[PDB]
Structure formats: structure tokens, C-alpha cells
């Protein structure tokens, strides 16, 4: 448009231009709305979809298939399953809740038992039998041994300049 080169999708805009402007800018330098030089209407501009790709795999040593997650893209234009962190292709949706090993996001995560995506479960749910006239006391005991690992230092390296 008159030397203004751009890429994106054009839509009929709603914002009102005073009779002496030519184009608008959302913030800083973001040319979003433009008035054409011939037919004298206003069209707004927005870039078309783009974004990263992630691969969910159970491991080559176990299986040989993967699933693909498109980040922040409403994939109606690319078993498709629409999540809040993009959308997942290659996985099936189930109702059951387990504890998962491959977190995806927004409370949704997937695993392989092929390649099912579900909602993680916090843990086993139980209710304590509270009363104002009864207590519980142990009768037996066990001795347990636990391990923990803590690093204290790393290697010493000296690099010259010349």
C-alpha cells in the first residue's frame, strides 16, 4: 500500500478515523489499520498464525511413535484435541485421572500404557473420622532408612586469553 509492505490478513475494521488520518498504530510502531488509496475505506491488519512445535515421546527404547503439540495455535487451519496450551495431534482423550509422567500444561498431561492425554489427579482421596470424643493411638512401630544426595563442588577450570 503506497510503499507500505506487509504480511498478514485483512479484515473490515470498526474503529473510526477522522477525515485527515491515513493509518493507525496500536502501540509504539504497530501498523494495524490502513486506508486504501482508491476506494477510501479502512481495513485492519493482523498477522496469520505461527508458533512453536513440541514432540511428546514415550522413549525410543520402549515404542516408536510420538505426538505433536502446536503451541498457542487454534488448529482449525493447520485425533485432534484442543487444549489450553495449543493443541495435541496423535493422542486420545479419556475421562480417567492418573498420575502422569509427561506434563503438557494447564492441568493436562499425557502418558503411554497408546499415548493418552488426560487430567492429572492430585492423589488418593479419603476422609478422616473426626469426633469430639475419640482419639487414635499407635500400637506398633517401624524403623525406616532414607537416603538423600547433596552436591558440594564442581571441577576447577582455568582458561587463558592469549
Amino acid at each position: 500500500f503506497n510503499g507500505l509492505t506487509g504480511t498478514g490478513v485483512l479484515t473490515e475494521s470498526n474503529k473510526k478515523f477522522l477525515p485527515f488520518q491515513q493509518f493507525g498504530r496500536d502501540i509504539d510502531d504497530t501498523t494495524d489499520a490502513v486506508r486504501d488509496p482508491q476506494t477510501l475505506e479502512i481495513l485492519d491488519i493482523t498477522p496469520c498464525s505461527f508458533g512453536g512445535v513440541s514432540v511428546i515421546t514415550p522413549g525410543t527404547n520402549t515404542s516408536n511413535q510420538v505426538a505433536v503439540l502446536y503451541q498457542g495455535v487454534n488448529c482449525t487451519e493447520v485425533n485432534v484435541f484442543q487444549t489450553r496450551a495449543g493443541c495435541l495431534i496423535g493422542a486420545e482423550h479419556v475421562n480417567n485421572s492418573y498420575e502422569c509422567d509427561i506434563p503438557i500444561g494447564a492441568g493436562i498431561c499425557a502418558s503411554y500404557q497408546s499415548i493418552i492425554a488426560y487430567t492429572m489427579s492430585l492423589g488418593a482421596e479419603n476422609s478422616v473420622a473426626y469426633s469430639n470424643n475419640s482419639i487414635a493411638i499407635p500400637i506398633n512401630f517401624t524403623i525406616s532408612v532414607t537416603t538423600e544426595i547433596l552436591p558440594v563442588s564442581m571441577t576447577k577450570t582455568s582458561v587463558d586469553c592469549t
Binding site: 476422609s127 473426626y130 469430639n132 475419640s134
Partner: protein, 276 residues
């Protein structure tokens, strides 16, 4: 996407600077991954998910102000709602390259974790941190807690009503402080302000000449011949690289202190709530 906006030749020139891009992506990914472990290690300290019984015979103490409210979209309590109101959706990646990722644990799961912790603390004392929860009446748990600081236990059993009324009044007095002095939550706003300012500076430093003839790549690529446009394409990569490096360094430095604060919060939860 940030340095060479949707261009082809600019990427071919950027390939000559070695690999000053795997490091930045790796560092940002590491920070993003660590941000999830920070939240995981604090709240996720209870194995099961307990819940309070419908019986509300706690000896006189009134916990209705902190227990979850079923008639709520998020099943939160009164104080959590007050806190949420006092702090001010498929988000796509902008043409700058900016991207915001959603947290792994949504707010509902955090609310469930806190509710489970509170129910266990009320109905089992400190016995649910070692092994299985062992029920004990609340009055006797509070008497045991007095016995732990020197005061004998017959002080509570003859002053139960006074202590209950004082606790109820003290709990009630906190709603006014939270809903009237909005400046109390100053520790949770400085982080957001600093992050916003840093990212705003990063975005705003895109429209700078840096010694070139234009601040936008398309203008240079549509006017200068390719033999002599290579000089003006440079002096533009070498400013954006420095901007990105500075942003990454400050992000790492300010994430270190967040990690330290998360560790302190985890310690406080471990030995202040579970025990005495």
C-alpha cells in the same frame, strides 16, 4: 523471529555469528522449567487429599472464614477471594517473538492442596506429617500446644470461652485490614512490575537505528542493492544481540532470588504448619 523479522537473507547472515542462539533458548527453557519445580516443592507436601467432615464441633472456634466455599466458581474461601481481588484464552506469539506459557498447576489444584493441608491440620494435629493422620479433638490439640511453650494445660480448660472469643475476633479483624489497606501486598507486586518493565524495554528497543539508515528491515531490503545492503544489515544484528543478552542475564540474576524465596517458603510450610 526477534532479530530477523520473517526474512531469509538475514538468517543467512546470522548463521555466520556462530551459535549465539542455542544458549539463550536453553537458558530461557531452564528458567521456565525451574519455575514449575518452585511451585511443586512448596504446596505438594501432602500425599492424600483429606476433607473436613460436616460436623463443626471444634469447641467454639469458628473456621468458616478460611474453609472452602462450595457455592463458588473456584471453590475458594473468603480470604483467598479478598487476596485475588486486591491484585491486578489461547494467547498467541506476537511478531516480536514474545510468548507466554500457562502454568502446569492451575489455581484450582493449588486451592485443593491448601484445603487438604488445612483440613489435615485441623483434624489431626501434627501427626499427619510423620505417618497416617490420627484424629484428636481440637480442644485437646490446643491444650497440647499450650503445654509445649511452658504453660500448663489446665489454663485452657478453665479459659476456653475467652480464648475462643479472642481467636474469633482476631480472625474477623483481618478482613478489614485486607480489604481496606491494599498496599499490604507489596511483595507480590514488585516482581510483576520489574518483569513488565524489563520486557517493555526489550520490546521498545526494536525501533532504534543503531547507526544504520533505518530501524525496520523491510525498508532496507527494499531500497539498497544486495551487494551493498550487507553493511547496513549489520550494525543492526549487533545491537539486538546485546539487548537480548542483557535481558537474559538480568532474567537469570533475578530468578535466583525467586528460587531462594521459594526455598524459604517451603521451609516455613514444612516446619511451621505441619509441626510447632
Amino acid at each position: 523471529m526477534y532479530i530477523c523479522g520473517d526474512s531469509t537473507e538475514c538468517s543467512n547472515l546470522l548463521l555466520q555469528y556462530g551459535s549465539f542462539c542455542t544458549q539463550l533458548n536453553r537458558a530461557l527453557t531452564g528458567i521456565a522449567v525451574e519455575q514449575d519445580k518452585n511451585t511443586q516443592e512448596v504446596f505438594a507436601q501432602v500425599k492424600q487429599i483429606y476433607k473436613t467432615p460436616p460436623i463443626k464441633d471444634f469447641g467454639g472456634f469458628n473456621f468458616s472464614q478460611i474453609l472452602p466455599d462450595p457455592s463458588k466458581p473456584s471453590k475458594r474461601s473468603f480470604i483467598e477471594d479478598l487476596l485475588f481481588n486486591k491484585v491486578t484464552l489461547i494467547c498467541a506469539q506476537k511478531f516480536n517473538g514474545l510468548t507466554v506459557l500457562p502454568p502446569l498447576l492451575t489455581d484450582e489444584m493449588i486451592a485443593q492442596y491448601t484445603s487438604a493441608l488445612l483440613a489435615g491440620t485441623i483434624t489431626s494435629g501434627w501427626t499427619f506429617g510423620a505417618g497416617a493422620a490420627l484424629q484428636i479433638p481440637f480442644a485437646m490439640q490446643m491444650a497440647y500446644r499450650f503445654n509445649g511453650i511452658g504453660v500448663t494445660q489446665n489454663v485452657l480448660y478453665e479459659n476456653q470461652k475467652l480464648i475462643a472469643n479472642q481467636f474469633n475476633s482476631a480472625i474477623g479483624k483481618i478482613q478489614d485490614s485486607l480489604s481496606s489497606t491494599a498496599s499490604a501486598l507489596g511483595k507480590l507486586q514488585d516482581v510483576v512490575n520489574q518483569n513488565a518493565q524489563a520486557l517493555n524495554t526489550l520490546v521498545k528497543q526494536l525501533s532504534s537505528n543503531f547507526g544504520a539508515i533505518s530501524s525496520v528491515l523491510n525498508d532496507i531490503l527494499a531500497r539498497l542493492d544486495p551487494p551493498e545492503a550487507e553493511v547496513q544489515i549489520d550494525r543492526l544484528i549487533t545491537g539486538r544481540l546485546q539487548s537480548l543478552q542483557t535481558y537474559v542475564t538480568q532474567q537469570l540474576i533475578r530468578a535466583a532470588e525467586i528460587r531462594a524465596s521459594a526455598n524459604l517458603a517451603a521451609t516455613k510450610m514444612s516446619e511451621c504448619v505441619l509441626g510447632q
